């Protein structure tokens, strides 16, 4: 762990360890009523050389300068440890070690901060792709960055992030259930404790606004996915490239640029993109035929199904590692909703614009990844508005949200007996609908069979594009 710099000893000393336990604690205390949003930091420092020991306290209000600190030199290590444990028990009401911690009123709560040959023979496009999805520099940057607006008190262990996730799901259950205002206040206090927020010196607000709650749930789910990817990176004589390829449990091939299926893919991408809600254009780079291990088997129950279609899906590149490792997955029942309008399931789009907007690519990383899946839709339950459903109606296999714009159905194409909606964007005759582009949804992981995967540059319409386009 890190030595708090307000002590001026990060180089002269180091935080102390013993019995497989570290002596740095970061406690939060919140009351939305009175508005209190306080932090308490406690450390026991040991000089890198001699038997010199310190106790460092700091306290104040999160994301502000209100507060103070104190550094004491202790005559010994044992006196330091006694001082540390007694201060901890004073400020939290619990002991230093305990399987079952119990919150006590007016007492702080502890926060779980997370600290810390060459003989490959694969084709170069695939090697670049692997370098892309298993990138460690970007992963470590995003994992252990320093954003004092989102994480005013440091990185949070995945445990606490999922705890707050469940608290938000409970908040939504409550708001649904004609809840007590106090039932909401308890969860609001607990959440803002588990996840420190920089509110300057304003009273933290209640979690009544369900929309901002969906937003915070999206944030927490993003952090969870990043934690999972990092844990997957930390999986010799084989080359590291092949080593990380074997983690995927998928067979990858590169379609020939001048191929025919490749040209059909390219026509799909070109037709179904729209510069109307996307300030960029798409450029294909490499096509990839993928075959996941076992997924080819679990999809057989549906291969004789009707209305199998080849559709888009798009996520951030970090997850793609996992996505090839364990196919596409549905959310759990205890997780909250993050914005999707049709419950928890596998989502697809028929227009690359929509699914690509979910790559969240940046002008600094114009590259993104995007999957093509043969999804067995069967019978479409067609809806125009949001609806958090649970049971499909008797006779339906999938759901479809109808937008105001759709590929030209007359241009459909059959690849291996699979409809492909590569037509151009035209108007659908659907009146009184909220979606702009169609959405397809299934609720059984086995109804999807990943077939292809694309690398794409997002050519943004900035000064460079403006010069190349005006000359």
């Amino acid at each position: 762990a890190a030595v708090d710099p307000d002590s001026g000893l990060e180089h002269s000393a180091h935080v102390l360890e013993k019995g497989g336990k570290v002596f740095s604690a970061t406690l939060g205390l919140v009351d939305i009523v009175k508005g209190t949003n306080s932090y308490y930091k406690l450390q026991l420092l040991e000089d890198d050389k001699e038997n010199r020991y310190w106790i460092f306290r700091s306290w104040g209000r999160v994301g502000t300068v209100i507060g103070s600190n104190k550094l004491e030199q202790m005559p010994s290590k044992e006196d330091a440890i006694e001082h540390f444990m007694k201060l901890y028990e004073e400020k939290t009401g619990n002991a230093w070690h305990s399987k079952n911690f119990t919150k006590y009123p007016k007492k702080f709560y502890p926060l779980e901060i997370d600290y810390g040959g060459t003989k490959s023979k694969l084709p170069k496009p695939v090697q670049d792709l692997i370098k892309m999805i298993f990138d460690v520099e970007s992963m470590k940057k995003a994992m252990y960055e320093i954003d004092l607006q989102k994480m005013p008190l440091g990185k949070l262990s995945k445990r606490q992030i999922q705890a707050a996730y469940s608290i938000l799901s409970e908040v939504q259950q409550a708001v649904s259930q004609g809840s007590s205002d106090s039932q909401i206040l308890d969860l609001s206090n607990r959440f803002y404790t588990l996840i420190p927020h920089d509110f300057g010196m304003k009273k933290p607000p209640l979690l009544n606004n369900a929309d901002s709650v969906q937003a915070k749930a999206e944030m927490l789910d993003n952090l969870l996915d990043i934690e999972v990817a990092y844990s997957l990176l930390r999986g010799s004589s084989k080359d590291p490239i092949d080593v990380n390829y074997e983690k995927l449990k998928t067979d990858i091939k590169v379609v020939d640029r001048d191929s025919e299926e490749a040209e059909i893919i390219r026509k799909y991408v070109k037709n179904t993109h729209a510069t109307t809600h996307n300030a960029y254009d798409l450029e294909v780079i490499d096509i990839f035929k993928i075959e996941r291990e076992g997924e080819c088997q679990r999809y057989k129950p549906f291969k004789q199904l009707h209305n199998r279609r080849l559709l888009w899906h798009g996520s951030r590149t970090t997850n793609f590692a996992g996505i090839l490792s364990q196919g596409l997955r549905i959310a759990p029942p205890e997780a909250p909703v993050t914005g999707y309008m049709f419950g928890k399931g596998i989502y697809f789009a028929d227009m690359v614009s929509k699914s690509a907007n979910y790559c969240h690519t940046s002008q600094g990383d114009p590259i993104g990844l995007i999957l093509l899946g043969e999804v067995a839709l069967g019978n479409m339950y067609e809806l125009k508005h949001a609806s958090h459903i649970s049971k499909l109606p008797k006779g339906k296999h999938s759901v479809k949200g109808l937008g105001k714009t759709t590929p030209d159905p007359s241009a459909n194409i059959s690849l291996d007996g699979v409809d492909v909606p590569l037509g151009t964007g035209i108007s659908s005759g659907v009146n009184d609908t909220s979606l702009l582009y169609n959405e397809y949804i299934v609720y059984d992981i086995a109804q999807v069979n990943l077939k292809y995967l694309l690398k794409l540059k997002f050519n943004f319409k900035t000064s460079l594009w403006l010069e190349h386009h005006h000359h």
């Binding site: 009351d31 507060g67 103070s68 006590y104 009123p105 007492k107 308890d186 404790t193 010196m201």
Partner: protein, 222 residues
């Protein structure tokens, strides 16, 4: 809750932020609540009642802008109200209710003075215990609540959190914990209460109260 505060000095130890001299104990003092730079909490900046108006604080209405006004002695309330400046049935009943308020105030204060005269702090703690009342921190609050109970009755526990209620300037606020994370916020001007019961030990001193229980009911600000 408010910005300004007024009370009798609980200790002769606070230095005035103007004249930087010890404010004596039990003396009228006025604070301005200011945020602290040392920790995440407001702190009172105390002034002698005199020094407080020389700092140019333009208090329009003390009864509302100053926390703890409704709990001072009557003549001191009048002093704070004056210094803050430098239709028949309606007005008639207005005057009569004002006199009733003065009555109740001077009454509670005579009770507290008799108590402090005859009883000890532990005697008052025992009086509170016997009546199923929580013992607060601070001699002042102890005898304040003893008087509350003796006038209106042993407060009955909260309906939800089961914690004791306490009279604030405007209502009986609950002081209990609905959970280790958040505190309770019930308020009401009509709290349930059973009759106050002085233990028989203090009967010799309860005749030193001459009974005079009365059937009074807490008069709240408009």
């Amino acid at each position: 809750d408010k910005l300004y505060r007024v009370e009798y000095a609980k200790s002769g130890r606070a230095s005035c932020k103007k004249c930087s001299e010890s404010i004596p104990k039990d003396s009228l003092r006025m604070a301005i609540m200011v945020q602290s730079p040392m920790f995440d909490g407001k702190v009172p900046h105390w002034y002698h009642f005199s020094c407080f108006w020389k700092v140019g604080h333009s208090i329009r209405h003390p009864d509302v802008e100053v926390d703890g006004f409704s709990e001072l002695r009557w003549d001191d309330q009048q002093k704070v109200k004056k210094t803050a400046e430098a239709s028949k049935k309606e007005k008639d009943k207005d005057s009569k209710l004002e006199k009733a308020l003065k009555a109740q105030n001077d009454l509670i204060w005579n009770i507290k003075d008799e108590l402090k005269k005859v009883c000890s702090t532990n005697d008052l703690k025992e009086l509170l215990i016997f009546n199923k009342q929580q013992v607060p921190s601070g001699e002042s609050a102890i005898l304040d609540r003893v008087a509350d109970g003796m006038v209106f009755g042993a407060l009955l526990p909260c309906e939800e959190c089961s914690g004791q209620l306490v009279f604030k300037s405007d209502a009986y606020y609950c002081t209990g914990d609905v959970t280790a994370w958040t505190k309770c916020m019930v308020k009401t001007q009509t709290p349930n209460r059973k009759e106050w019961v002085t233990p028989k030990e203090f009967r010799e001193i309860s005749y030193l109260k001459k009974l005079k229980v009365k059937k009074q009911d807490r008069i709240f600000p408009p």
